[PDB]
Structure formats: C-alpha cells, structure tokens
C-alpha cells in the first residue's frame, strides 16, 4: 500500500496524493533489423505506474480554475507525465485510477532514481 | 413545528418510500396558475339572468336555474367559451409529480395535472367517465371524480349544477367506489382545499360512518392566510383528520399563495427525500433483520444501504452514493471513540452493541482512507465444510430445539446424501413457518433438481420409490421460482434485498463476470511482469472466494454442490495457484484452502495444475 | 423458449409441446390462404430473413450505420438535414452524440420524448436520454478532476445553466422502475427491452474457455443490436469490456487451437475501438499476431485513411472538440498501432504517416511513442519516397523548434529524432537532407540546442553541413561520444576518448562513496561490454568492480557471483553479442543454466529463441 505524491516539476506544490497499485518495468529491445560499429546497447526501456485511489489538493484545484512523482524506503520518479484516458460505465461512478509514465531526457538519459 | 407536524412529515415520506401515497389535489392548486374559477362563472350566469350580483347553495343553484329555464345550448356554449382558455402549468404540478404519487385524485376538470405528468414522462391511466374504469391500461390511476372535458365540452361531462350533485351516487357509482377503496388502502394527502369545502364535508361524513381504527387518518394541508384557530383544530382533529398549516409555519402576505404552497411542499419533498441518535436508529432497522443470517457477503452490504457506501472485500468502506449526512462515518467514530458512543440513549446503546457484535463478525473495519494493515483471517464455522462426517449424524438424531435447528438438521441430511428425508421435513418447515420460509422454499426447489438429475444419471439402483417421485412431481411442476421473490410481502422484498440471487438459477451470475475481469487482469500481470504493491487483484479473488464460500456453507444453501458453484471455486484456485507459481519463480498453502481443492476439483484438473 | 433460436440462424424447438406452428410457417414460406394473412405472411417474411432468421436446423453479418464505419463526415451532412419523421429524430440525436455535441442530443431526445404519443421509441429515447446524462456527469467529473491535469487547462464544455438544468430532471428518476411504469400492453408486446435498463453474454463467454463460431457470430448480433438501434449505451465501459474479453480470449484460443482463424474488416472496428494500447501490447506478448491472415484489405485502407483524415481536419483548424476528442483519440491511436500488420497504398501511406507526425497531438504520443507507431507501419509497407519526404520535413520542423533553451524533446519510450534519421538512412543510405543542411550552413554558436541536435542527424546532412557542424563540436561529456558513435563518426576508440570513459568511472566512483542510489543510465554496461567485445584495449576499469551489475559480468566474468544475474540480460544483446557470449565459453554452462530456467517457468517464447539460435 504505497502512497503516491505527485507534484509539478517547477515548484514543490503537491498536484495530488494517491495510492500506488501497479508498476511495470518491462524493458525490452526494439526491432533488431531496423535499428561492426561500436556497441551502443540500444533498448526500448519503458516504466509505467498506476494508482487506484487519487485525491487532488484543494489549493491545486483552486489555483487551476513537467512533473515529478514520489511513492513510498521511498522511491522517486522524475519527468513523469500522465495518460489522460477516460472511459464511462453504465453503473454510476467510485475509484479514480490514474496511470502515468516516466519520460527520459536526452541530456541525462535516466528515467528512475531511488534513494534509501 | 415542534411535534404536531414532524410526525406527519416522517409519515408522509415513509409512505412515499413504500410507494403508498395519493395526493387529493384540490382547486386551489389549479387556480394558483391562472384559470377561471367557478364563482366568476356563477356570477356571469347571474348577470345573464339578472342585472347585478355568495353562499354555496347559490353557487349550486344559479347554474341550475340557468340550465332549467334557458335550456342546454346556451349553458353549453358559455361554459365552452369560458373554459377553453389553455394555460401553462405551475411549479406545484411538477413538485407534486416529483413526490412520486401512486394515484392522483383530482376534483378538477382541467387537463392540467395530466399534461405535467406527460411532460415528466410518468404514464398515468386517466379515469374520467364511467366506462373508463373497466378499461384501465395501468395500475396507476388519475381519478377525475368530477369528470372532465376530454370527451367534449357539453355540460353533463362534468358536474357543476345542483341536481348533478344530488344524483352523483347513482350516476358515478364505480368512480365513487374506486375513490373510497383508494382512500382506504392508501394514505391520503389533501392539497389546495378550503377547510369548509363541500367535498371534504361529505368525505368526513363517510369516514364518520366507518368503525374505529379501521383507517389511517388522512393529512390535510391548509394554506389560508389566517393562523389556525385552536377550536377548529380540535374539531377537525376529532373528525379523523391531521392538519398541517402554512400560516403557522411561515409568515407571508395574504394576496400571494404560490410562496406558501411552495414552502410547505418543498419542506415535504426535501425533508429526507442529522445527529448520532437518529443515525444509529436509522441503520438499526436496516441491519437488525440480518441477525438471522450467520454470515453476510460484503459485496452485498451495498444493496442493504441502497448502494450508499461501497464495501470493499478487505474491510474498507468509501462513500459511494451519499449526498446527505455521513451517517456510517459517524457510526465508525462511535466505534473507534468510546466517548461519543458513551453519550447515547440506553436503547440505542443496547442497539449499538448488536451491530458492534455484527460488524466485528463480518470483517468490516473502517474507511479505506483510515485503513492500515489488514490480516486475511477467515474462519469457517460450518461443520459440513470441515468434513466432520460422524458429527452431523450425531447432530441429526438429536431432537430439534427450534425451527432454526430444524433447518440446520435438514441441510445435514442433504449433506449426508439422504435428500429424501431432507425433503420430507423441508415441507415440514414450510408447514411450521419468517425469513427461513424463503430459505426453506428455494432449498426445497434446489434439492428437487439434484434428485431429478441424479435419477437420470442412475437410470441412464433405485434410491427413491416412485410414489416419492410421484409426490415430488405433482407439487413441483406447477411451482415456479422466478416469481418467488416478487410473490412476497412488501416489507420482505424491501428489507431482504440481498437475497434476490438465491431465487434465480444463476446464483453466481454477477460473481462470474467480476472475476473474469480480474482473471484477464491477473493473466495480464502474467506477461507484463508488473508487481502489485497495493492490495492485489489476486488477493481480492481469494477474499471474494472466502466471502462467497462462507455465506453458502454457514447459511445452509444447497448451491454448495452445484457444478456452477464447483466450477466457480475450481477456476478461482487455478489462477491463484498460477500466480503464486509465477511469483515464486519471478501465496502459501493453508488447511482452509486444502478443503476446496480436495472438494471441488476433478482428477484431470489437478494434473493440469501440475503440468503448468 | 418454445423454439430455441440458435445463433447460426436455424430453429431448434426447446419448450413447445403442442402443435408445431413454426414448423407450418416455414413450410408455407418455402412452398407457395386469405389475402389479409398474405400481407401478414409477406410482412413477416422479409423481417425474418433480414434479421438472419431463415429456416429450421434440419433444413456473414453486415452493419450499415454511419457511426459504425467511422463516417465522421457522411453523417455530418445528415445532421443538417431536416429530420423527416420521429424515427429520423431518434437516429439524429444518437448521431449527434457521437461527434461530441452531447448538449444537442440532450435537446432532441427531450423533444422526441414529449413528441411521441406504438410508444416503443419513447422507451429507447428515455434510455438514451438517461445515458447521455450519466455520460455528461462522468465527463464533467473527469474535466474538473483529470482534465485539468491532462490537458493543463479547464475547458468546461457545458454551461452552468445546462448542468443545473439536467440535474433538475433526472433526479428522482431511476432506470429500474421505468419498465414497470409503462402501459401493460407495452410490457407484453416488448418483453425484451428490460435488459437494457453486455452482462448476459459475458457469463457465456467464461463458460467457453463450435465454441469459436458460437462466440464470434453472436458478437455481431450484439453489435447489430446496439449500434444499429441507435442505443447510446454502446459508448460505455461495460460493453467495451465485453468486446475486450471476447476478442482477446478468441485469438488466444484460436492460436492455442492452431498450435486456424482469420478476421474481416468488421473485426478491425472492435479491436481498434474498445482495445487500449496495453490490451494490444498484452495481446502481442501472449500470442504472436503477425501470423494472422488479413483479408478485405480494400476496406481497411479506406478506414485508416479516413480516420487519418479526421485528425488532420480536427487538429489543423480551431484546435479540437474536447467532447469529441476523448472518444475519438483513443480509437485513433490504437488503429495506427494496429496498422503494422496491414498493407496500404503509397497515397494512403502518405496520408496516415503525415497525420501521425504533423497533426498528432504531442500530449498523447510523444516523440518516442510516435516513432514506434511510425516504425510498425514500415513492417508490412516498405518505405516510399513520398513518405521519406514526410519524415524529412518533419525533422526539419523539429529543428526549428530547437531554438528555445528550455525546450528539449522528451520521450517516455526512450526514442528521439535521431532514430528517425537512422531509419531513413536505413532504407536509402544516400539521403541528403537539403533543408536541415541549409540550416546547418546557417548554424552559429548561439543555438547550442541546434548543434547537438543536428549532431544526431549527421548522416542525413550534406558533406558541406558536416564540416560546418563539426567545427563547433568536440567530445566534452559522455553523451557526446555516444552521439558521435550513434551516427557513425567514431569507428575506433582514439587515445583521447580513452580518457573520458575512465574519468567518468572516477566520477561514478567518487559519488558512490555512504548512501547509494539506483539509476538506469546504462553507461557502465556500455563500458563493460566493450571490454568483452575488445573494442576498448585498456585494463583500468578493473578497480571499479562492484559499482553495478553488467559491468564486472563482461570484464571479469570468472568471479562475478552469478547469483545476482538478471535473466533479462540476454535480451538486451544482439546477434553478434550472443555468439561472443556463447563462444567465450568461460560462462556458457552458467548462461545455459539461466537460459534454461526461464524457458520452463515462463511461456515468453523469446528466451526459447535465445536458447536455440546460439545455444549460449
């Protein structure tokens, strides 16, 4: 039952607080034929996270009329962007699940960092 | 508004919840929206007969005289040209619709209430003439006890003149009978009526004719500007009425009626469609009956509260469909904090420990927000599940202390395979029978099915004599189970809602679909290799399985042996073991899980788990 | 239940015990009675045949609705048409709701409800009217809660008056008691429509895990029931889930039974619509879907081009319709992801590629995810020269935006504009970008973000631009050398470059020494694998043993303590590396032990390939 703290990258303001439910690190290679020279270690590494319960801060929703996510001993995730996919059910709806993925910058070439 | 109006308001809202309420619409409501009221018409008739211009007898007589001397055509024409002015409806109509009345009795002759009813979309069977009562196309009636102009504008379609009121009984017998029986079998709320109205007087005479305590005292809403006098209040209270005044409720001017109608009616509709004592009283009635059942499925506790709060299988609750007070949130603060629970009434506190005895025994803990670490501790206090095969024979020969044990030993015989004797006393419980009557009814139906399928299996040994097979068929072939829940007292199918699925043959229709989404979700986690940090979809499958299994065994439902149930149990363990194998090479075995694999799995299936 | 009507269109009696009336009917239907019954017989005739009812058991389903085919333009002129009849209003409001415009549909469905006085159409109108209200509230909930987070701004497509108006009416209105509160004649004549007020066929799906035919055919029956009847609940999650479970299970079972099945144009619609990018990706992993035969390729070309036309019209003019965006964008991204396995004409390929690159919003598919979407199309369809131009000026426009110092392209997938240039160079090996080289000719020291961007696309640039760009560039940091290596500038490790790698190793040694953190820069692995490949010829990194895994594994494998070996290591290597690892022979028994454990524990079938192609 890890707790998720989603903030904007520009400031330290908490965008929201959630409960982490799933995380995927299923990195793999791309197509070999389409992509003697020096070895490069090409890969298609991807990391995704999903939370089942979310709660947006009152100040954030009041002021809102790049991001960083940290979930808890505790592990950070810089340059994370959400996947705003919505689907509606015939049954009235109530657990807002939010899925987000960590971006990789060209200059730093790192996607996940964890401190202890 | 201290005592003598709150009783009325809770009674009316309770009746509305049950669906048993009827609104006696008066003439004040119809005249609130602009409409030519009667005294304009009678003074117009007078100005026709005489030069210059009122008691009720004159109201009845002047049109009577005009009809007598001037004939039919003139009266018909003036009435038609004075009552043909169409008007838009007023908000009171949509309010009285939104109150959801079972039937509507109106002494008005305008097509105004029906227009609003059609605009809202509710369908009502309009009753205007004598013959229309026989051809009623629905069970909800809009009685126009004084006729209307739908058939035409000719005078006799409605009743206005004196002789029409004299010959009302002999000209409208069926409509009068319908009005009397609807008043008798429902609750009646009078709206927009002057206290000195003639219809109210005749109706009060009729209710005077009846015997004592043979009816509910009808509720009468008065809205005259003068505050109610005590003397008339006593006079009409002893006259079998209970009266609510808008003059004492608020203050307003004498020449506006819309605001005073709106005040009382909005108070009526908005009030429960507060404090802790009401809260614990509120959920007690919703929770007290279920003490008959040892175990309750958590996924069904939502249906107890009309889907108010979502119960999670892990013991956590989040507000789902609450727009009023957070009553159960308050209850948990009574549970966690003894201080506030100490400050409660004795009877409420005596109630409180019962749910405190209840909510502990079913595993619910607190909110999901306030939840912490939860242990998956499940116990099965059912002898059949533990397989103490000598014991139920000991439990069977003993004399039955009560009818509850009579059902318990009846299922023990079914567990022992001797369903012939099990059926024999199953009819006895039905004879002796009242929640168990429903449980005795369906299990008698399920147990018949197993024997019939068993009969085909053996024939396609003679365990049962033909006469026992003859008697089983005569009583059963007529018996249908689809109507069983509908064929029940109104309180029972309202109070006991979480028992609907035992009736239909598909007792696990919902539980299968919800597991498949998890199953594909779990098999999704197989390939993508994603850890489940939170409460995993696989655990809730085990929690759901333990939830459903406990209800079926503890409460003695014959569905514990059906192939649909056995397949449902088997398919749950197959994936949970499958996940554990993949987790290990990236759940541990217990005695409780050892029973289900040994009980509900076929031999070939066990090989399939070994092979994978 | 008197005659159990099975899915195939034949008749099997199940409950009728008296005289057989259905038996008599088809006999008169087959052979060649009063005239008033004749018109009843003929009227009953076409209804049965049109509805798929033909004859008994003893003796291809199509959908024609503008919404199902994705005709977001044919049905637009229908909207402006004056609806002739009441039924014309019913299809109109359903059609109005698909292209957003939920407010317009709410108006019309209200009008028909008060208009209609059969009365059956009043039921579906009531059901649809409630559904859009349920639809609107969920969308309103998303926009204020998640719409601010996703798009970054508040849209509020509906005025406060409308949302206050709608809640006033649907309150105290339940879908459960709607059916009961109807004329008793209506209840008897229409005993079927209660289930509307999806769940039923989902249970039957579980029981079947022929099975494939009886599951596949009824799928169109539901689609011919919801879509063809203008039923708005066909836009909800539960129906999506039923389609999601039905198709996903069928292909798994078909592939399992194959180890045949083919799918038509109609089978493109459901996978493109109700399946997400994870469902398709999960479907790829469990079973290989490239073996599937793709018939009716003519239909798929018009669909993919048409859906690529809509995004070009939408995003290029006056932003986009937020109401229509959520429903359509999800269908659009999956279809392009799908289009790897289909064959498309050159004109169509240019249409879909241009929309995928230029007019596709960045917030949905970043440069990494847009690249793999593009790359997948290259599998079945070889690169045409027109598409080469599309990728050409796409990079040129990207170079233009590389002027702001804050703006750097960020990709979750880990792929950027460099891989585009390699892809064009892969298919051409002679492409010279005139526009980018021209900007490289006008390249000065000011635009630093420009220097390192054209560095990644050096082979595409002309020789004149190569000299111009190289003058201001030198190997400074670690990423610079791999940027030069990726393009192909460096083919041998010069003595100077030997100093940057070891100095970084000093840096990684310096910062490692009481609190440690774990990252995924995979820079130590590149240094270590080079020693295994002998590309480096310096024995000075042996003092950094224990810095991280995949470093001592390729420098001193004889004492790596392979208990920490991650089996997913063999995947990241290539054909040359796998032979080298197998041919080194100092850990082949160890690798063949880790290669064999995964093949039995998991069904990934890729560890099977690595086990087999080189026997490492």
C156 touches A at CB < 8 Å: no
Contact C568 A27 (CB under 8 A): yes
Residue B70 to residue B593: CA distance in whole angstroms: 94
Contact A84 C146 (CB under 8 A): yes
Which residue of A1, A26, A48 is in closest CB contact with B534? A1
Interface probe for B, chosen from C17, C202, C276 (most Cβ of B below 10 Å), is: C202
In angstroms, the separation between the Cα of residue C241 and the nearest Cα of chain B is: 8
Which chain B residues in 84-113 lie under 8 Å from chain C, judged by CB atoms? 98, 100
B6 touches C at CB < 8 Å: no
Angle at the Cα of C219 from the Cα atoms of C213 and C220, rounded to 5 degrees: 105
A94 touches C at CB < 8 Å: no
In angstroms, the separation between the Cα of residue B327 and the nearest Cα of chain A is: 19
Which residue of B100, B512, B527 is in closest CB contact with C203? B512
* The pair of three-digit structure tokens given for residue C354, joined into one six-digit string: 């241009």
Whether B110 is catalytic is yes
Residues of chain A with Cβ-Cβ distance to B321 below 8 Å are: 92
Resolution in A: 3.6
Cα separations in angstroms, C211 against B567, C206, C249, C272: 18, 11, 11, 24
A58 touches C at CB < 8 Å: no
Residue C471 to residue C443: CA distance in whole angstroms: 11
A10 touches C at CB < 8 Å: no
Give yes or no for a contact between C209 and C253, defined as CB atoms under 8 angstroms apart. Answer: yes
A with B: how many residue pairs have Cβ under 8 Å apart? Answer: 37
Residues of chain C with Cβ-Cβ distance to B517 below 8 Å are: 241, 245
In angstroms, the separation between the Cα of residue A11 and the nearest Cα of chain C is: 15
Give yes or no for a contact between B91 and B259, defined as CB atoms under 8 angstroms apart. Answer: no
Neighbors of chain C with 3 or more C-beta pairs under 8 Å: A, B
Residue of B nearest to A18 (CA): B369
Question: Which residues contact residue C54 at a Cβ distance below 8 angstroms, ignoring those fewer than 6 apart?
Answer: C9, C10, C48
The one catalytic residue in B146, B186, B193, B546 is: B146
Residues of chain C with Cβ-Cβ distance to B570 below 8 Å are: none
Residues of chain C with Cβ-Cβ distance to B524 below 8 Å are: 278, 282
Residues of chain B with Cβ-Cβ distance to A24 below 8 Å are: 528-530
Residue of A nearest to C569 (CA): A28
Cβ burial of B56 (10 Å; 0-12, 13-18, 19+) is exposed
Contact A46 C145 (CB under 8 A): no
Q: Which residues of B touch A (CB under 8 A)?
A: 310, 318, 320-321, 368, 525, 528-535
B482 touches C at CB < 8 Å: no
Residue C126 to residue C112: CA distance in whole angstroms: 9
Residue B462 to residue B464: CA distance in whole angstroms: 6
Give the number of other Cβ atoms within 10 Å of residue B434's Cβ.
11
Question: What region does B253 belong to: left with phi over 0, alpha with psi -120 to 50, or beta?
Answer: beta
Residue of B nearest to C237 (CA): B517
A90 touches C at CB < 8 Å: yes
Listing from the earlier edge strand, what are the strands of the sheet with A14-24? A80-82, A98-102, A48-56, A14-24, A3-8, A67-71, A74-78, A113-115, C517-518
Chain centroid to CA C213: 26
Residue B383 to residue B553: CA distance in whole angstroms: 9
| H/E element, A48 | strand A48-56
Residue B443 to residue B449: CA distance in whole angstroms: 10
B509 touches C at CB < 8 Å: yes
What sections of B210-275 are H helices per DSSP?
A: 230-237, 246-249, 258-270
Paired sense of beta strands A104-105 and A67-71, if any:
unpaired
* The pair of three-digit structure tokens given for residue C106, joined into one six-digit string: 């709410």
Whether B50 is catalytic is no
Whether B547 is catalytic is no
* The pair of three-digit structure tokens given for residue B154, joined into one six-digit string: 């000719």
Q: Which of C358, C361, C354, C313 is nearest to C333 (CA)?
A: C361
Q: Which of B428, B455, B457, B463 is nearest to B443 (CA)?
A: B428
Give yes or no for a contact between C572 and C554, defined as CB atoms under 8 angstroms apart. Answer: no
Contact C240 A87 (CB under 8 A): yes
In angstroms, the separation between the Cα of residue B530 and the nearest Cα of chain A is: 4
Cα separations in angstroms, B434 against B401, B502, C566: 17, 16, 64
Residues of chain C with Cβ-Cβ distance to B119 below 8 Å are: 114
B with C: how many residue pairs have Cβ under 8 Å apart? Answer: 58
Cβ burial of B586 (10 Å; 0-12, 13-18, 19+) is exposed
For B329-363, the DSSP string reads HHHHHHHH-HHHHHSS-HHHHHHHHHHHHHHHHTT
Residues of chain B with Cβ-Cβ distance to C244 below 8 Å are: 520
In angstroms, the separation between the Cα of residue B78 and the nearest Cα of chain C is: 32
Q: Which of B116, B48, B115 is nearest to B82 (CA)?
A: B48
């Amino acid at each position: 039952t890890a707790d998720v703290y989603f903030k904007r990258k520009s400031d330290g303001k908490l965008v929201f607080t959630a409960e982490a439910q799933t995380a995927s690190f299923s990195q793999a290679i791309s197509e070999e034929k389409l992509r003697k020279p020096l070895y490069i270690l090409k890969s298609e590494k991807e990391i995704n996270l999903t939370v089942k319960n979310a709660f947006f801060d009152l100040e954030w929703l009041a002021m809102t009329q790049r991001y960083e996510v940290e979930y808890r001993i505790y592990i950070q995730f810089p340059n994370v962007s959400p996947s705003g996919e919505f689907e509606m059910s015939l049954e009235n709806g109530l657990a807002p699940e939010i899925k987000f993925e960590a971006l990789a910058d060209t200059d730093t070439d790192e996607m996940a960092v964890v401190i202890e | 508004l201290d005592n003598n109006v709150v009783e009325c308001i809770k009674e009316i809202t309770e009746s509305s919840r049950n669906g048993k309420l009827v609104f006696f619409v008066g003439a004040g409501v119809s005249t609130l929206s602009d409409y030519p009221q009667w005294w304009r018409l009678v003074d117009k008739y007078h100005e026709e007969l005489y030069g210059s211009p009122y008691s009720s007898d004159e109201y009845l007589r002047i049109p009577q005289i005009f009809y007598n001397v001037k004939g039919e055509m003139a009266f018909d024409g003036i009435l038609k040209d004075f009552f043909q002015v169409d008007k838009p409806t007023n908000p009171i109509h949509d309010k009285i619709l939104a109150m959801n009345p079972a039937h509507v009795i109106t002494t008005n002759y305008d097509n105004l209430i029906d227009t609003a009813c059609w605009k809202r979309g509710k369908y009502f069977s309009v009753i205007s003439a004598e013959e229309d009562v026989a051809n009623a196309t629905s069970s909800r009636y809009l009685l126009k006890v004084h006729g209307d102009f739908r058939k035409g504008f000719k005078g006799e379609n409605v009743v206005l003149k004196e002789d029409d009121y004299l010959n009302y009984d002999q000209n409208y017998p069926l409509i009068s009978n319908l009005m009397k029986t609807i008043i008798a079998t429902h609750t009646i709320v009078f709206i927009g009526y002057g206290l000195g109205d003639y219809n109210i007087n005749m109706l009060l005479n009729w209710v005077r004719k009846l015997q004592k305590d043979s009816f509910h005292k009808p509720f009468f809403i008065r809205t005259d500007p003068s505050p109610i006098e005590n003397e008339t209040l006593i006079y009409y209270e002893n006259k079998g009425l209970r009266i609510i005044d808008a003059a004492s409720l608020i203050d307003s001017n004498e020449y506006d009626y819309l605001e005073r109608y709106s005040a009382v009616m909005d108070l009526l509709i908005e009030s429960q469609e507060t404090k802790d004592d009401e809260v614990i009283d509120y959920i007690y009635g919703k929770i007290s009956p279920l003490f008959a059942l040892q175990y309750i499925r958590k996924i069904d506790l939502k249906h107890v509260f009309e889907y108010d709060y979502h119960f999670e299988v892990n013991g956590t609750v989040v507000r789902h469909k609450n727009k009023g007070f957070g009553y159960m949130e308050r209850f948990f603060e009574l549970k966690e904090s003894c201080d506030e629970r100490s400050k409660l009434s004795k009877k409420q506190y005596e109630r409180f420990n019962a749910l405190f005895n209840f909510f502990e025994k079913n595993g619910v803990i607190c909110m999901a927000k306030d939840a912490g670490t939860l242990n998956t501790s499940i116990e099965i206090n059912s002898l059949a599940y533990h397989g103490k095969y000598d014991v139920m024979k000991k439990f069977i020969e003993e004399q039955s202390v009560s009818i509850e044990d009579d059902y318990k030993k009846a299922f023990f015989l079914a567990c022992l395979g001797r369903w012939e004797e099990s059926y024999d006393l199953y009819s006895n419980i039905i004879l002796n029978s009242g929640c168990v009557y429903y449980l005795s009814q369906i299990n008698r139906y399920r147990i018949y099915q197993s024997i019939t399928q068993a009969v085909t299996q053996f024939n396609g040994y003679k365990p049962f004599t033909d006469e026992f097979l003859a008697r089983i068929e005569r009583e059963m072939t007529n018996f249908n189970i689809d109507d069983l829940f509908n064929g029940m007292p109104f309180e029972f199918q309202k109070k006991y809602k979480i028992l609907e699925f035992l009736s239909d043959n598909q007792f696990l229709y919902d539980d299968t679909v919800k597991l498949f989404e998890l199953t594909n979700k779990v098999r999704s986690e197989m390939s993508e290799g994603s850890y489940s940090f939170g409460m995993s979809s696989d655990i809730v499958v085990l929690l759901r399985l333990y939830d459903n299994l406990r209800f079926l065994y503890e409460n003695c439902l014959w569905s514990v042996s059906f192939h649909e149930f056995h397949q449902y149990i088997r398919n749950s363990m197959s994936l949970l073991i499958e996940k554990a194998e993949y987790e290990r090479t990236r759940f541990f075995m217990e005695y409780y899980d050892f029973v289900n694999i040994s009980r509900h799995f076929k031999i070939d299936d066990i090989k399939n788990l070994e092979r994978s | 239940y008197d005659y159990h009507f099975e899915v195939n269109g034949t008749v099997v009696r199940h409950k009728n015990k008296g005289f057989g009336y259905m038996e008599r009917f088809f006999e008169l239907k087959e052979s060649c009675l009063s005239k008033k019954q004749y018109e009843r017989f003929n009227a009953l005739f076409n209804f049965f045949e049109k509805n798929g009812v033909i004859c008994m058991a003893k003796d291809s389903i199509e959908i024609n609705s503008l919404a199902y085919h994705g005709k977001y333009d044919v049905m637009k002129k229908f909207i402006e048409e004056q609806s002739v009849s009441i039924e014309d209003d019913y299809k109109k409001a359903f059609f109005l709701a698909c292209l957003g415009r939920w407010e317009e549909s709410y108006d019309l469905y209200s009008n028909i409800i008060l208009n209609s006085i059969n009365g059956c159409v009043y039921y579906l109108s009531q059901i649809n009217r409630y559904r859009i209200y349920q639809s609107i509230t969920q969308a309103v909930t998303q926009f204020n809660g998640l719409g601010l987070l996703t798009f970054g701004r508040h849209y509020k497509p509906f005025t406060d008056e409308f949302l206050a108006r709608i809640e006033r009416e649907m309150t105290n209105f339940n879908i459960d008691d709607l059916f009961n509160g109807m004329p008793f004649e209506f209840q008897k004549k229409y005993k079927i429509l209660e289930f509307l007020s999806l769940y039923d066929d989902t249970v039957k799906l579980f029981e079947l895990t022929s099975s494939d035919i009886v599951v596949l055919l009824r799928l169109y029956d539901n689609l011919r029931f919801l879509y063809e009847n203008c039923l708005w609940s066909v836009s909800f999650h539960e129906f999506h889930q039923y389609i999601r479970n039905s198709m996903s299970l069928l292909i798994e079972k078909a592939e399992y039974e194959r180890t045949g099945f083919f799918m038509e144009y109609y089978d493109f619609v459901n996978i493109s619509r109700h399946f997400k990018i994870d469902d398709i990706k999960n479907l790829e992993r469990s079973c290989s879907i490239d073996k599937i035969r793709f018939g009716e390729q003519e239909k798929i070309e018009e669909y993919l081009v048409g859906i690529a036309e809509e995004i070009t019209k939408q995003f290029s003019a006056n932003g986009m319709n937020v109401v229509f965006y959520t429903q359509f964008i999800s269908e659009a991204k999956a279809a392009l992801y799908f289009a790897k396995y289909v064959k498309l004409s050159e004109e169509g390929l240019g249409k879909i590629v241009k929309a995928l690159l230029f007019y596709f919003p960045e917030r949905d598919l970043d440069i990494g995810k847009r690249y793999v979407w593009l790359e997948r199309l290259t599998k079945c369809n070889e690169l045409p020269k027109s598409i080469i131009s599309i990728i050409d000026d796409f990079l040129v426009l990207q170079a233009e935006k590389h002027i702001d110092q804050n703006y750097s392209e960020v990709s979750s997938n880990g792929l950027y504009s460099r891989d585009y240039g390699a892809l064009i160079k892969h298919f051409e090996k002679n492409f010279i970008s005139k526009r980018l080289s021209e900007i490289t000719l006008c390249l000065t020291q000011d635009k630093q973000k420009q220097i390192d961007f054209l560095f990644k696309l050096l082979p595409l640039l002309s020789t004149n631009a190569k000299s111009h760009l190289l003058s201001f560039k030198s190997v400074e940091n670690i990423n610079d050398l791999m940027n030069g290596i990726r393009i192909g500038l460096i083919d041998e490790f010069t003595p100077e470059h030997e100093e940057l790698i070891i100095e970084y190793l000093e840096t990684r040694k310096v910062n490692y020494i009481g609190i440690q953190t774990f990252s995924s820069n995979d820079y130590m692995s590149t240094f270590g694998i080079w020693y295994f490949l002998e590309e480096i010829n310096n024995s000075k990194m042996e003092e950094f043993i224990g810095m991280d895994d995949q470093y001592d594994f390729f420098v001193d494998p004889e004492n790596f303590d392979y208990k920490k070996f991650i089996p997913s290591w063999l995947k990241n290597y290539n054909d040359k590396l796998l032979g080298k690892i197998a041919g080194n022979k100092h850990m082949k028994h160890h690798v063949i032990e880790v290669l064999k454990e995964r093949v039995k524990n998991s069904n990934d079938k890729r560890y099977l390939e690595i086990l087999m192609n080189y026997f490492i």
